[PDB]
Design an enzyme around this catalytic site. Structure first.
Site, PDB file in Angstrom:
ATOM      1  N   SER A   1       0.831  -1.133  -0.186  1.00 36.90           N
ATOM      2  CA  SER A   1       0.190   0.258  -0.014  1.00 36.90           C
ATOM      3  C   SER A   1       0.811   1.239   0.332  1.00 36.90           C
ATOM      4  O   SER A   1       1.666   1.682  -1.024  1.00 36.90           O
ATOM      5  CB  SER A   1      -0.879   0.040   1.044  1.00 36.90           C
TER       6      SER A   1
ATOM      7  N   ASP B   1      -9.261  -6.232  -4.620  1.00 32.92           N
ATOM      8  CA  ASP B   1      -8.828  -4.858  -3.730  1.00 32.92           C
ATOM      9  C   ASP B   1      -9.912  -4.350  -3.429  1.00 32.92           C
ATOM     10  O   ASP B   1     -10.553  -3.338  -4.291  1.00 32.92           O
ATOM     11  CB  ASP B   1      -7.718  -4.864  -3.734  1.00 32.92           C
TER      12      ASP B   1
ATOM     13  N   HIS C   1      -7.532  -6.915   0.945  1.00 30.47           N
ATOM     14  CA  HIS C   1      -6.617  -5.840   0.587  1.00 30.47           C
ATOM     15  C   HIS C   1      -4.885  -6.000   1.433  1.00 30.47           C
ATOM     16  O   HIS C   1      -3.758  -6.110   0.716  1.00 30.47           O
ATOM     17  CB  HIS C   1      -7.085  -4.710   0.915  1.00 30.47           C
TER      18      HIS C   1
END
Length: 261
Positions: free
Chosen positions: A92, A213, A242
């Protein structure tokens, strides 16, 4: 900046592995998937300044206004540990950071493995980001509103899969984050973009793709493979979530070693 963002090291070997958690979570997130490698590489893992398990007083609202300083720190750490050859695993947020840094030091990076990575979290004209001015502000909305409430509804999504543990563990970190902090870090990411910059990456990367996701459109998993040039294979995890690092470390573990080094 060493104890500041409580860095730490485990295992041994000529190989130097790295693990950079992303939004919400903190280094503890790797736990459930660290032993799987500690017996082969030298794993390093810190905790972003925004993190909850970190003194907030180090987070300067006049500094981390974008994504650059966050890449400084990362390198500042690498130097204090004096390192030239290693493997970065960013998810991320820390995924972008690795990208930015990956160009500022095509040396200190051998194999850039990204997890749930994204270029622009905002969708452009000829770009599908999955979130537009509305979609985001809507979230920013309830966010500054009832944080305690917002988290309760987010965790379940990111994690998605039916894993009460790997979904509850995310709330923990999500709470330790002083809202202000989270509040900010959000807008920055969403206001951040590094499309063009991608082609520049020389290091042979490696993008991760999950079943679905909640914050990164699927198509995107291909747009990356598009403007990279460096030997960049975008593999996929036959699972949901995710943040696989927790949702199902089983598979991620095994699949990780198939790339790095």
């Amino acid at each position: 900046i060493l104890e500041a963002l409580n860095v730490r090291v485990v295992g041994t070997g000529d190989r130097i592995l790295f693990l950079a958690h992303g939004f919400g979570t903190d280094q503890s997130a790797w736990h459930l998937i660290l032993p799987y490698f500690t017996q082969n590489y030298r794993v390093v893992l810190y905790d972003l300044v925004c993190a909850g398990s970190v003194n907030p007083d180090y987070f300067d609202f006049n500094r981390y206004t974008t994504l650059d300083p966050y890449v400084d720190d990362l390198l500042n750490i690498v130097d204090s540990l004096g390192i030239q050859n290693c493997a970065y695993v960013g998810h991320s947020v820390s995924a972008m950071i690795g990208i930015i840094a990956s160009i500022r030091r095509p040396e200190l990076f051998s194999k850039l493995i990204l997890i749930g990575f994204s270029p622009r979290f905002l969708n452009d004209e000829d770009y599908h980001g999955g979130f537009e001015e509305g979609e985001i502000e809507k979230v920013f909305s309830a966010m500054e509103a009832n944080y305690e409430a917002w988290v309760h509804g987010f965790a379940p999504l990111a994690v998605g899969a039916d894993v009460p543990a790997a979904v509850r563990e995310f709330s923990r970190t999500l709470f330790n984050m002083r809202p202000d902090i989270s509040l900010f870090v959000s807008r920055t990411v969403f206001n951040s973009d590094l499309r063009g910059v991608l082609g520049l990456v020389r290091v042979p990367t490696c993008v991760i793709q999950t079943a679905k996701d909640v914050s990164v459109p699927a198509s995107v998993a291909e747009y990356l493979r598009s403007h990279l040039g460096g030997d960049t294979t975008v593999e996929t995890l036959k699972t949901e979530g995710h943040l696989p690092q927790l949702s199902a470390p089983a598979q991620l573990a095994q699949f990780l070693r198939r790339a790095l080094p």
